[PDB]
Paper text:
The dehydratase (DH) domain within type 1 modular PKSs is responsible for the dehydration of specific C-3 hydroxyacyl-acyl carrier protein (ACP) intermediates, resulting in a corresponding enoyl-ACP. Here, we present the crystal structures of the borrelidin DH domain from module 3 (BorA DH M3) and the [name] ([name] DH M1) at 1.80 Å and 2.01 Å, respectively. The DH monomers from both BorA DH M3 and [name] DH M1 possess the traditional double-hotdog fold with an invariant His/Asp catalytic dyad. Within each DH monomer, the substrate-binding cavity contains (1) a hydrophobic tunnel/phosphopantetheine (PPant)-binding region, (2) a catalytic region and (3) an acyl intermediate-binding region.
The fluvirucin B1 PKS utilizes amide-containing dipeptidyl intermediate 4, likely derived from l-aspartic acid and l-alanine. The second DH domain, isolated from the first module in fluvirucin B1 PKS, accepts an amide-containing polyketide intermediate. Unlike the BorA DH M3, all residues between α3 and β11 were modeled in the [name] DH M1. A closer inspection of the residues between α3 and β11 [name] DH M1 displayed partially higher B-factors. In silico docking of the alanine-protected dipeptide PPant intermediate 4 with the [name] DH M1 revealed key structural regions and residues that may play a role in substrate selection. On the surface of the DH domain, the conserved Arg 298 was in close proximity for potential electrostatic interactions with the phosphate group of 4. Within the catalytic region, the C-3 hydroxyl group of 4 is in proximity and oriented toward the catalytic Asp 231. The variable loop region between α3 and β11 (light blue) contained polar residues His 235 and Glu 244 within 4.0 Å from the terminal amino group of 4. On average, there is a 9.5-Å distance gap between the terminal amino moiety of 4 and the bottom of the substrate-binding cavity. The gap identified between these polar residues with 4, the high B-factors associated within the invariant loop and the lack of modeled residues for similar type I DH domains suggest this structural region may adopt a distinct conformational change upon binding to the native substrate.
Residue numbers in the entry:
A (entry chain B): 25 to 47, 49 to 243, 245 to 300, 307 to 311
B (entry chain A): 25 to 312
Write the structure that this text describes.
Amino acid sequence: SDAGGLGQAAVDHPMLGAAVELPQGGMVLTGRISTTTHPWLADHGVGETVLFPGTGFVELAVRAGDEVGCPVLEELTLEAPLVIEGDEPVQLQVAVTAAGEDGRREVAVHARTGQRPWTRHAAGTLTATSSTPSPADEQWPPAGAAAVDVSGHYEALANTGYGYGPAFQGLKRAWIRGNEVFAEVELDEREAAEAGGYGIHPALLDAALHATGLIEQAGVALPFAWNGVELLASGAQRVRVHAQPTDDGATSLHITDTTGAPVAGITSLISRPLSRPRS
Amino acid sequence: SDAGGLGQAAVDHPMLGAAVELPDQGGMVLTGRISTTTHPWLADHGVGETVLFPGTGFVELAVRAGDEVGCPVLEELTLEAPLVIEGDEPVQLQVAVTAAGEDGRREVAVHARTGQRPWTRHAAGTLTATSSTPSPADEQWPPAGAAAVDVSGHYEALANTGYGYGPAFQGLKRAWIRGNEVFAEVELDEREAAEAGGYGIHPALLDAALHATGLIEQAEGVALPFAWNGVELLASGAQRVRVHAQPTDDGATSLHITDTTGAPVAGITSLISRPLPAGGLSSRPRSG
């Protein structure tokens, strides 16, 4: 009704607030973030530089898909980092094309501050074509997986270069079985309190990625290309994570809640680092 | 602001409240909403018992979107589909503006819908930044040689012809005729005068500026604005205006609008009206 009073459709999301139907046209969803209204934002980055997490673009792209009946995120490549400076407000736009005749829509995420030019930070494809989801869990912790000591894992990433403040220090337990890694990940109470409003809170899905850096440790490397991403259940505060390599050279991830019920499936996640590297 | 909290830009206008820049190489869309409850003058323009959004409202919408992209001049606008206002149901408005070409010209379109109906395009045209060199403010008012006209029965005549002009749209107060030219003074009712400052030009004021042109032709039948060319708004928020209408060689009318001190307000190079088919938008009258 805020949005409705402007002639648009209200969106009830912590980061997106209005939907603008274009008349073939497609659709645009808009929103505004900052470290005042999303304090967890200040806890993710590279050194002193803050970066909107890759998992936030996944959350945004899936939520736009929900609005057009295309919840499956078939593909998503991340292009430019979204540097957030201080408590500057950041305008967000998620642009969704009309459906092609193959059913697929293109999705894009743009952002800017002030009147500086918009920059495209994410681009991919949305569909309603769904893959059959991975079965639910049973035995936890999984049989034959050895418990790993992550007691000081966030310090190993603190001097490697990663910038994970308290909201993104989610990894609590991990195990290794062969090339598989298992993990328990949970939000702090502050982000836990907001979690119910998201598809999957961006800080929780990011921290679900942290245990993959246990099997093979490569400097700083961040999610880059996602493939076959489906959110299965919403509002999670704590999750279990099952990560495996693909023979495509990437990582599969199957996310469940504390009862083993599916939360999220990621068919493949490629990550990449980055003149001169850091140390 | 409201629009700011949604990640958009606010627009301060009575009918449009938000500007959404479309990054990519697309342009802009401005959005708003209207209803007889928030815009009571809507109820006072139509044909028969059918409330119709005034074509001048589309001129106002298109020009306001032009200002938002630094393209203030309405080079051309064609009205495509009438917009019926059904009771007090709200109407969603969208004004789409393209990226400028190499010419510096932008395409503009106005869409509307109520409830969950599909959008309908009501107006399409072209904005430019090119301004016309202004027309002379030469003032004896009224001009020499102009003969006063009794307009006391004018709106009663227009009613009998078929026009539906309620109180907010009965702004024609005085008129003079010289050759095939008409001069008019037009004033908003107090209710519309109070909100006129926020408009580029109140749609009810611009529409009544068109009422004096029928005094020469005395056309049988109802006709509504259809095509506009060279619409420049030179001064915003007028309540009372002077009007100078004359034909062009197109079968069209030009109009130059000044304020009550003779200063420029708006210029319309060409306006074409089109006859309304009996039985099109309201029922036909009953034969006698």
